[PDB]
């Protein structure tokens, strides 16, 4: 009865965790912010339109100077744009057409891309030759690659469909650390603005907070009903917001180990595809399947400042570091900049 | 125009050349024939690939009658199909392979599950998907010599309880083909092509060509109005 005893102990520990989480709840966030005046109506205009992709668009990322962009499409192309004059700075052809993610180095010297070939490719932008070369190919995963984010010019972290995440040292090309524990496919991850921890969301409707230097799972969060498609992280470092396939978004807090609010509406019965915050964390922007993306007040959970103007599903959206513009892409092969 | 410096003008010219190159590649990329390959485990698809003179996704190329064919085999991906199938939404056709002589073999740890019923379930799931509502299927039936040799002592009633016919190769093969084609739930927007493969039957590549031609013509009849 050793297996039965171990399962019973696991259930007892789960019940203890639930009891610990029950006694810490006093008042929902909508009660502490009942005296906050609403932000009113928010309207944005399209300032630029970026054209040139000839298929669906799956990822984009902002540079730290708030001036340059990189975007990936399934025509086999990675494009770096200047967003003030709508000029093209670089165009890079990939080896495998089925790309699914992008990352841009925080210094500005490197880009990364991966997809349905179980490989992460790293490209060098600043050479003595005038062209862009392939700097590194990282292999060792067994299922498709769904996200990747630099930490510096030497270390990267990736997530795959194996249920495993990995931390790699670029110079040698070897897996420095592996993070295991999810049951289903991992679809997204979001670093923290100190590169000390990170979060991951999986198809088993769960999220996990991991420590990077130790290399082990630190916390877990549940509550959704279906798989999680996108995850973001609050600016101050103590919260994060998730978006699942339930037509719901949610906010979780690390220190209280609870759930804070849910953002959903009765007229929306589609799935979310991407979320992001704003510089002061007062506007949560989320893309949807209805061909348009919505804007939510983040402290009162009541707004939809629709950014209509796309003809297909919104794949990706992002906000600059200074915070003046917002970019969206979609399956109709157009990017749009709003403020 | 007149408010630009020399360096800005050089940047504009560079962007324009990049645009032209992108456009040329995009025009070239739209005259290829993209086929998606499917078929349950150990169903002769390897022999099919071998005959026509050809981890992650595996991709194969060839050229027939001045046409460029690219075949995609994604058999190694052990994940859930509802996460990567929409990436193949705009393919020209789906090739499907099954084996005729697997109607009396045990598939899984349970002896009840035979292979032909699993292949029928897979075909049903592919045919009536929501991302393939007007994509055509080309169906290959393999190992016909072995089936003909086996039916002498093995009756087809072992797998189809309601079969009330003779025990000859022709009628059994026709019954199997009909039982497969009777699963198309979208009979007006979709068409199904069926073939009986053979070792010396090189025609099984020509057959593919023929089907593709029809598909192309139909698509043209939707560009120039008329549909």
């Amino acid at each position: 009865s050793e297996l039965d005893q171990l399962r019973q102990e696991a259930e007892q520990l789960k019940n203890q965790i639930r009891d610990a989480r029950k006694a810490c709840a006093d008042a929902t966030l909508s009660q502490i912010t009942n005296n906050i005046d609403p932000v009113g109506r928010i309207q944005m205009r399209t300032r630029r339109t970026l054209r040139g992709h000839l298929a669906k668009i799956y990822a984009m990322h902002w540079g730290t100077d708030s001036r340059l962009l990189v975007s990936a499409s399934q025509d086999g192309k990675l494009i770096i744009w200047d967003s003030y004059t709508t000029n093209k700075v670089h165009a890079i052809p990939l080896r495998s057409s089925w790309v699914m993610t992008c990352a841009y180095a925080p210094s500005g010297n490197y880009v990364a891309c991966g997809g349905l070939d179980n490989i992460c490719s790293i490209y060098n932008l600043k050479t003595r030759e005038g062209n862009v070369r392939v700097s590194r190919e990282l292999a060792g995963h067994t299922g498709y690659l769904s996200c990747c984010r630099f930490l510096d010019d030497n270390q990267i972290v990736t997530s795959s469909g194996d249920t495993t995440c990995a931390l790699w040292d670029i110079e040698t090309g070897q897996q420095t650390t592996t993070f295991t524990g999810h049951t289903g496919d991992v679809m997204s991850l979001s670093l923290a603005p100190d590169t000390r921890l990170f979060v991951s969301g999986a198809c088993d409707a769960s999220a996990k907070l991991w420590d990077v230097r130790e290399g082990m799972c630190r916390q877990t969060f549940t509550g959704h009903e279906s798989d999680i498609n996108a995850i973001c992280f609050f600016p101050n470092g103590n919260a994060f917001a998730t978006g699942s396939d339930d037509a719901t978004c949610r906010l979780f807090d690390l220190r209280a180990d609870q759930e804070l609010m849910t953002y959903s509406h009765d007229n929306i019965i589609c799935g979310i595809t991407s979320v992001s915050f704003s510089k002061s964390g007062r506007l949560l922007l989320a893309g949807y399947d209805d061909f348009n993306c919505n804007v939510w007040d983040a402290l009162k959970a009541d707004r939809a400042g629709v950014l209509a103007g796309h003809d297909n599903r919104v794949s990706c959206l992002g906000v600059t570091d200074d915070g003046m513009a917002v970019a969206t892409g979609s399956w109709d092969s157009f990017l749009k900049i709003w403020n | 125009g007149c408010t630009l410096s020399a360096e800005d003008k050089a940047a504009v010219e560079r962007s324009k050349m990049i645009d032209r190159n992108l456009r040329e590649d995009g025009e070239k990329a739209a005259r290829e024939v993209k086929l998606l390959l499917l078929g349950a485990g150990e169903s002769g698809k390897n022999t099919i690939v071998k005959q026509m003179k050809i981890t992650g996704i595996v991709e194969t190329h060839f050229t027939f009658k001045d046409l460029h064919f690219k075949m995609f085999d994604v058999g190694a991906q052990r994940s859930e199909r509802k996460k990567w199938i929409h990436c193949f939404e705009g393919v020209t056709a789906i090739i499907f392979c099954v084996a005729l002589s697997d109607y009396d073999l045990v598939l899984a740890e349970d002896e009840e599950m035979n292979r032909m019923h699993a292949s029928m379930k897979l075909f049903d799931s592919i045919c009536n998907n929501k991302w393939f509502t007007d994509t055509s299927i080309i169906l290959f039936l393999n190992k016909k010599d072995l089936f003909e040799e086996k039916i002498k002592k093995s009756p087809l009633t072992i797998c189809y309880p309601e079969y009330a016919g003779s025990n000859t190769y022709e009628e059994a093969a026709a019954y199997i083909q009909c039982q497969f084609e009777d699963l198309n739930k979208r009979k007006d927007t979709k068409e199904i092509y069926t073939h009986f493969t053979c070792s010396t039957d090189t025609k099984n590549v020509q057959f593919v060509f023929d089907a593709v031609t029809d598909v192309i013509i139909k698509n043209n009849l939707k560009d120039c109005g008329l549909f």
Partner: single-chain antibody
């Protein structure tokens, strides 16, 4: 990266000649090119410009109509053709590489030059000094001046600083008045404000003495200074 020029020699008055430049070690078809000239004992003088894609060509006021510039991309070669050569065409010519996109460094690699011996809305640049005596370990400051304002409306300031050592070819030091080139010690600096600009050196060493030039790139034609010969 390697540019090699050829075609120089002795030419009698009138006549004609053709100079060529062969490139190796970089993507030659993504770069625009310039031909520049230096008199036997005077400063630098710009000659001609061609761009990437051959969709733009520029000449200088004293050469236009007599010179012709062309490029051959499959073979990676650059050509200049000169006809009706006068006595003011005795100098040393250099081929210069340049690339323009947001954030690039133009005028970064210079050739080795070849010699040729023959038997007004332009901006004026003024090198206020001609020689400076210094000792190693000290600090030095040089300044030059313009006539118009080099600062554009988008925020840039197009001023360049080059060094030429004895027996060598120029070597880019600073582009756009404050940006240090790649492969240069951090003891050099540039600063200034409209119409007056200053280069600064700290803690001199040997092999750090030569002639400094300041150039503008606000509009064509491009105009050089006269040069300051720092001495030790």
């Amino acid at each position: 990266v390697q540019l090699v020029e050829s075609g120089g020699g002795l030419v009698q008055p009138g006549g004609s000649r053709k100079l060529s430049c062969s490139a190796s070690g970089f993507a030659f078809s993504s770069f625009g090119m310039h031909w520049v000239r230096q008199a036997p004992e005077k400063g630098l003088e710009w000659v001609a410009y061609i761009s990437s894609g051959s969709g733009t060509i520029y000449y200088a006021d004293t050469v236009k109509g007599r010179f012709t510039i062309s490029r051959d991309d499959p073979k990676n070669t650059l050509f200049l053709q000169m006809t009706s050569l006068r006595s003011e065409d005795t100098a040393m010519y250099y081929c210069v590489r340049s690339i323009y996109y947001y954030g690039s460094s133009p005028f970064d690699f210079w050739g080795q030059g070849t010699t040729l011996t023959v038997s007004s809305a332009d901006i004026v640049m003024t090198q206020a000094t001609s020689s400076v005596p210094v000792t190693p370990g000290e600090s030095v400051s040089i300044s030059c001046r313009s006539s118009k304002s080099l600062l554009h409306s988008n925020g840039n300031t197009y001023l360049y600083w080059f060094l030429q050592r004895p027996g060598q070819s120029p070597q880019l030091l600073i582009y756009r008045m404050s940006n240090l080139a790649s492969g240069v010690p951090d003891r050099f600096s540039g600063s200034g404000s409209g119409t007056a600009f200053t280069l600064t050196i700290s803690r001199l060493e040997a092999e750090d003495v030569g002639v400094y030039y300041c150039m503008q790139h606000l509009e064509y034609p491009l105009t050089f200074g006269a040069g300051t010969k720092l001495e030790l």
